[PDB]
Amino acid sequence: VHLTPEEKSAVTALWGKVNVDEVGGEALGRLLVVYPWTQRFFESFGDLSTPDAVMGNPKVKAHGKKVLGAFSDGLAHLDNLKGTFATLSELHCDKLHVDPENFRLLGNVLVCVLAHHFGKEFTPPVQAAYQKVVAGVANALAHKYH
Amino acid sequence: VHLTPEEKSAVTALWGKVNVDEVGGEALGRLLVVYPWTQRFFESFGDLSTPDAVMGNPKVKAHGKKVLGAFSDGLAHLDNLKGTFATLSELHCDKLHVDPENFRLLGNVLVCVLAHHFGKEFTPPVQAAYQKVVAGVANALAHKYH
Amino acid sequence: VLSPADKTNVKAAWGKVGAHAGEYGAEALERMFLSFPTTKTYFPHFDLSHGSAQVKGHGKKVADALTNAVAHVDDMPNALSALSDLHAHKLRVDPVNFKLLSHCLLVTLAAHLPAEFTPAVHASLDKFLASVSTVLTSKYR
Amino acid sequence: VLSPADKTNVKAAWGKVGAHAGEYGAEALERMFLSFPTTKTYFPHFDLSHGSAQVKGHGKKVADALTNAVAHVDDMPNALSALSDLHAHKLRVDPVNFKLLSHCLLVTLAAHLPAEFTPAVHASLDKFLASVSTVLTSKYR
Ligand code: HEM
Ligand code: HEM
Ligand code: HEM
Ligand code: HEM
């Protein structure tokens, strides 16, 4: 099962209610800084060493917007997660072979940057709901191994 | 998604092809011995300290047969896992509050005792398939938290 | 196991935390139980509902224990050995829930200090909380 | 960090392992890649199919490194510090996959020695492999 319809509506409503622009790119920069060995997967991006060049990297902010749009699709079409996360799941499993706790690190650092960008607009129900939706995203994105 | 129909058939076929009796009770004894702090959840069983009294415990071998029958139901009705794991999931979440890596420990020690009880009847495809079915069992048994 | 630069950064940010240590520990346990409900077996006699006073009290206690770990920054297993004993033997707590509470505390710290929570001090404090969990898993009785 | 009794037990069982060390490391990597396919990024140039000879060779190498850790039983981080350096810095390997391979090796050891794999020696060898993963996560460069 999953959450309440009211709390899943709160999930998509407050994710629409973020400042929709750079939260993904800042989450990428935060992930790569606070865990510096995740960029073994991201060596092809070039600018991955210093945080300032990370924020200036068009590849980093483009990957942030790409993850942001993927989250937008996965939360708009929240009913069928495993239908929406199909090509991304195939890529992450077969081509990328990402170790499945890196999705744990990324989901938790996204939770940290959303807490940073809200403060008083981040109810701990909204935090637990967001932890659940990114756990469901990480499961639907790591299932073709299995 | 899930496995091949042929490999899920191999899962239920070889689980029917185990010596069906005491593999669950031996897995319980092995779990409680190789991890001695899981029995914080199992303090009510009495005989939980020495392995010999564990194997002699009617509560331990009864819980082994109960887990064995639950696995029998969850692998016979393998299509609807979350329908079969309903009362057990409610118990494990609400009443028991089992930390979700203890299901990881139990699934992996069951894999160890099935490897012990087969040897040459344990193909590493069958091992990976069994790891997947006990990960699905552990997910369907830890989902009412979420 | 840090630089003097980011050690200076975390002691300055922890001074900015300051007398909100009890409040931040209260909200850390609040978000802890609301987020990872497997952990409520370890606090059964409390009233597991919205904003409990004993939850706030124990959050104050745990937060100031982490302030003691801050004040003994390079001596962290020496400082936390008694609690490692208590947790791994007395209460028998699974040793990655310390990492769970550590990241939850980082979420509430970023929620409460967003005009200071740079990714640099974020990385420093994440390594610090990794270390606190690391010295509570070395179950030195 | 063991008793002399179960240390004697694991060195006797490891002598029973013996010259099947290369074979057991081969099957351990076989079951490793077949079971946790996230790990095949760390061995890309190999032929990730049924029974590869270089997989068997590297399994022999890793198994005998664990035999060196057996021969240096109480000196395990001292023995494995160079590999900890290699893995955490050169190859940049996530540090719980050592626990993954440790349990997979226990599965193949129980598969191959079922007339010796008592729960007692099982618990001893599980604590041992926990220790090997523990000293490979302390990334002492
Ligand atoms: C948790 C949710 C995640 C989402 C929604 C996501 C989504 C995406 C997207 C949209 C792309 C771009 C595909 C393309 O442009 O063709 C991508 C590629 C990639 N992802 Fe992620 N990803 C996630 C997690 C991760 C994690 C945790 C890692 C760990 C390092 C990772 C590593 C990569 C890499 C290396 C690429 C290739 C870069 C590229 O194609 O430009 N992803 N992923
Ligand atoms: C992985 C598959 C598991 C299955 C299929 C399973 C199944 C069961 C079953 C059939 C019962 C008996 C319910 C009753 O008789 O009313 C039970 C109870 C219980 N389970 Fe498990 N369980 C699993 C995992 C675990 C784990 C990992 C733990 C960790 C300690 C655990 C702890 C308990 C406890 C403490 C009880 C209560 C004892 C009792 O009711 O007699 N279970 N579970
Ligand atoms: C991460 C760093 C942590 C620190 C510094 C810490 C600190 C403390 C301290 C100082 C006490 C003693 C309170 C007293 O005097 O009664 C305590 C008790 C306790 N801790 Fe924590 N703790 C930490 C993490 C955790 C976690 C994650 C749990 C998970 C549930 C936990 C469970 C407990 C429990 C059950 C008690 C006993 C509470 C009581 O009996 O009143 N601790 N802890
Ligand atoms: C658990 C104990 C482990 C031990 C004792 C061990 C031992 C070793 C040794 C001795 C080498 C050097 C081989 C050479 O001389 O080229 C090596 C290399 C390597 N290890 Fe392991 N290893 C362990 C676990 C792992 C795990 C779980 C992985 C996960 C994928 C891993 C990944 C690698 C890789 C990628 C190499 C480089 C292989 C090459 O370049 O040929 N190791 N390991």
Numbering used by the authors:
A (entry chain B), B (entry chain D): 1 to 146
C (entry chain A), D (entry chain C): 1 to 141
Relevant lines from the article:
Here we found that the uniformity of thin ice relies on the surface flatness of the supporting film, and developed a method to use ultraflat graphene (UFG) as the support for cryo-EM specimen preparation to achieve better control of vitreous ice thickness. Using such a method we successfully determined the three-dimensional structures of hemoglobin (64 kDa), α-fetoprotein (67 kDa) with no symmetry, and streptavidin (52 kDa) at a resolution of 3.5 Å, 2.6 Å and 2.2 Å, respectively. To verify the imaging quality enabled by UFG support, we prepared cryo-EM specimens using 64 kDa hemoglobin, 67 kDa α-fetoprotein and 52 kDa streptavidin applied to the UFG and collected cryo-EM datasets for single-particle 3D reconstruction. All of these three samples of small molecular weight were mono-dispersed on the UFG with high contrast.
The two-dimensional (2D) classification of hemoglobin particles showed a rich distribution of orientations (inset) that enabled a final reconstruction to be obtained at a resolution of 3.5 Å. At this resolution the side chains and bound heme molecule could be clearly identified.
